[PDB]
């Protein structure tokens, strides 16, 4: 009934009134480790110690070495399934590696580009599976690269749709991906999805897969995902230069104090370093030795990620319990229960996402902007909301999610009622 | 006139004897010696359990593009720049210069008519010579045309500079090392700075790339007073003209230090808007390391005096060896820098490329002839850069003495022809 809707809306008004009265100051936008997680690697603050030399004898305190410490690259070679000469180590930002590679592609073109992308006078286009990473889209938006949203399925993106786009459009030069524990879909690419993406024919000869494996070992269970050899499949398929692989220890060690990694064919490595050499003499070797001494080996990082999991998994479980209690009866919402990564993706009643965050903002609860997971912040259904549960304490988290549920219910009946 | 031929023979035997000694030395590495890096070995155990900066910031976590205020304050004093006008980045000041050029080409400066890549009249930079090869590699790779400018004693030819910038709108910038130049060793005078920030430009978005890389890198016990290039520019109505750069790569660890960028509040906001598309923020833990290590600006000055104790004898050694073997024949000239990391040696014209070839054939690595010029084009084929910071004093004297043997042989060789 329209009248029983009006009755429920009133109950939601009192709950919002009561929630507003609690005058809170919570935040669900911070995709950063908690202080408890960062304590796990406090040994780094005293590393490397007096021994400033890596196992090869190189003085990490002095200029030199573009590829990075081989000992550290060997640890993540195993974790990612990439050969050491196909993997380099940079500074504190993997996003900076992605941005530089896009900027190099526009200014100088890829290793096999017909011309720099800026010289294509009609334009450049990237494919962006949604919901996706906002900072992925900020790179292409700032660089004038147009972005084409792609639906996300269970085992990866819509490969049928991608294969038709890249076949007809030479302007499509790349695609943003998070192939493991997607931000924020939580979706991990299947072996078949990987196989077809590196095999599909592209109108652009220099099409690139931006393989941001940012959560490669960031499990929320006791199981670690088997990495698909995207570089090996691409080489066997005749497209060795297609994948650009990225990873980072920002959510393994310190967020912003870790090490970044880039992986690709030997030509792509040489191509990137030729232009990165005009920018920097080389990366920070001392921090790379800090992580080498701290980790020890690849089995060490795996154990380190299980201590992160012990801190993180109860928080993801709490968000699922609160949303299930407040919202399952309403049948207005759906949300992921991810096996890894740092984000839960919540879908509320269409046309209420922007309203839900506005209502939450004015009771002291900061929520990720509606549409952040989409290029140009354009969620066509006005329903998606990203939830970042890693940082706040369990009690702060319990109240933020419970408050967010109250606003989502109020915004729901408000939309059904007045329209 | 054949007394030349008599001397050439003596030079041939000295080269023959030099070659027979089968050396393997290097005067190319512009790096601190291991002894210099040892002064900063306390950094290898810093910051310690207290991961928080004086403001309470957890440096281990995401956030903050400006950098730690405590460290920015230390170098605010050392450079003569207000703290809000200065930011701290990662381990490379060269990467700040590259990004700012790339931002200027793709997006244009804070007050540019259009991105530089959209200029059909091309983009041009003025490059005082002898200069920094990595400065020129940026503009060379970016397709920016480079204009060599002669260096005088108090700075570059400002009269020539003011003529070019006044008539050519395509001239958008200029590469400078304002104190202890790489490799001229020249420090810009107050008058030269005042004119460069006051000269009027055909390009409304002209930029002084003020790479103050050797700002506190003295080879005496006195420190150079920094010119307030930003204040003079602001009072002259060109607040956005200077981009200031500095580094701790020659202060602490080469490649493990902190970089700095300075400018007007608009240029800081302009840079950070596009640097935010590139990175969530710089390494705050390493900036906390240097803050704990330095303590204050007076600590950095003391640290630079420890570097001077190691560096000054090496520059004095190179001067003594070149004066001994070369001054009598009057073919060569070289700088005696009061600071910086490089000595600039000029031999006879048409001799540099031959001198480095002769030196490479005796196991002595000399920096490529012309490397201090855009496109490596030394029109007189005479300049040779000497980097005396890294090798041992014995290794240094042998390489420099061997260098003089080759320069004299290539001199006599050319005189005949
Ligand atoms: C998918 C993805 N890529 C990149 C990043 C940024 O990582 P980094 O610290 O290496 O720049 C994030 C962090 O949230 C992310 O979720
Ligand atoms: C050595 C030097 C630098 C050092 O820059 P980093 O990227 O921090 O290593 C910068 N400018 C000049 C002119 C130099 O000689």
Numbering used by the authors:
A (entry chain A): 7 to 425
B (entry chain C): 8 to 424
According to the publication:
Here, we demonstrate that Rv3722c is the primary aspartate aminotransferase (AspAT) in Mtb, non-redundantly catalyzes the specific biosynthesis of Asp in vitro, and is essential for axenic growth and survival of Mtb in macrophages and in mice. The overall fold of Rv3722c is similar to that of other members of the recently described type Ic subgroup of PLP-binding proteins. Each monomer consists of a core domain (Pro52-Gly302) that folds into a nearly perfect α/β motif comprised a central eight-stranded (predominantly antiparallel) β-sheet surrounded by eight α-helices. Rv3722c also contains an N-terminal auxiliary domain (Ser2-Leu53 and Asp303-Ser430) that stacks and forms an elongated segment on top of the core domain, and consists of five α-helices and an antiparallel β-sheet.
To elucidate the structural basis of substrate recognition by Rv3722c, we have solved structures of the enzyme co-crystalized with Glu or Kyn at a resolution of 2.6 Å and 2.23 Å, respectively. The structure of Rv3722c pre-incubated with Glu demonstrated clear electron density of the amino acid in the active site located at the convergence of the auxiliary and core domain. Glu is engaged by both polar and nonpolar interactions. Canonical AspATs coordinate the side-chain carboxylate group of dicarboxylic substrates through a conserved active site Arg (or Lys). Our structure shows that Rv3722c also forms a salt bridge with side chain carboxylate group of Glu, but using a structurally non-homologous Arg residue at position 141.
